[PDB]
Write a protein that binds this ligand. Sequence first.
Ligand SMILES: Cc1ccccc1S(N)(=O)=O
Length: 283
Amino acid sequence: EDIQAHYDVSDDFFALFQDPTRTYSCAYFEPPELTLEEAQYAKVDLNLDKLDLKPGMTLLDIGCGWGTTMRRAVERFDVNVIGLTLSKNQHARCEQVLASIDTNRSRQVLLQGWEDFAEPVDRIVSIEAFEHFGHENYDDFFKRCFNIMPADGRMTVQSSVSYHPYEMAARGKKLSFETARFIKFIVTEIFPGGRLPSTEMMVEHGEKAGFTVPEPLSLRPHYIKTLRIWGDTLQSNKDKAIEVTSEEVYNRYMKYLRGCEHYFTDEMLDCSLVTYLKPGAAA
Ligand SMILES: Cc1ccccc1S(N)(=O)=O
């Protein structure tokens, strides 16, 4: 409780390694020559383009961050938006981002989890929403998402994933134990109290709730590029980053960024964009 609170880091630190949109998730470098900022917009479009969004629909963003996804949805698809965040700072920024949009569409941001959310919505997006998707309870999550959507409902969940210990063992015990200890570090110091799901968990929990689940998209090569730029950017701002936090916090995040790039390159971690289609989803 108070132990986890030790790993609280101010928004200002994240600004010193992230692109100007402050997107804390895997970018999408298509085409490959996109800047990180351009690739973060490409990742939002990759997710939204899977959701069959029509004007006047309501999109739910579970873990709406700084509001980039919701704004893009309103602008591109002329939809109403509801965002869920557990960050007071993100809630405030999202309200101002949405209010700034020239639209008559409904825009709402709620300081709550999905557990408490029970309003009808047409489509759902959730992009590396650690505070929502990082504490298991997957049967309740997929049941909620299924039940709040209409017959043609669709959802995307983008999540960092690990492999089951059995699958990790296949690459040899040395690398399996090493990866398992690095994952423990991630869910202790970077995403405290977290549980990193597997792609198989993401798929099978969706299917149990009644969703059709096509082949998940691996973003592995995109996360390698994202983490390389994040790491290189943090290192370039070392003095600034240490001033705002400490040498401890700087070393912690360089370990996270360099470490994740390594285990992604070694195919011991992955990032899955999973699509969940209700039985009546358009073909
Ligand atoms: C879902 C989860 C769980 C543990 C750590 C990190 C994540 S993430 N960044 O939301 O995909």
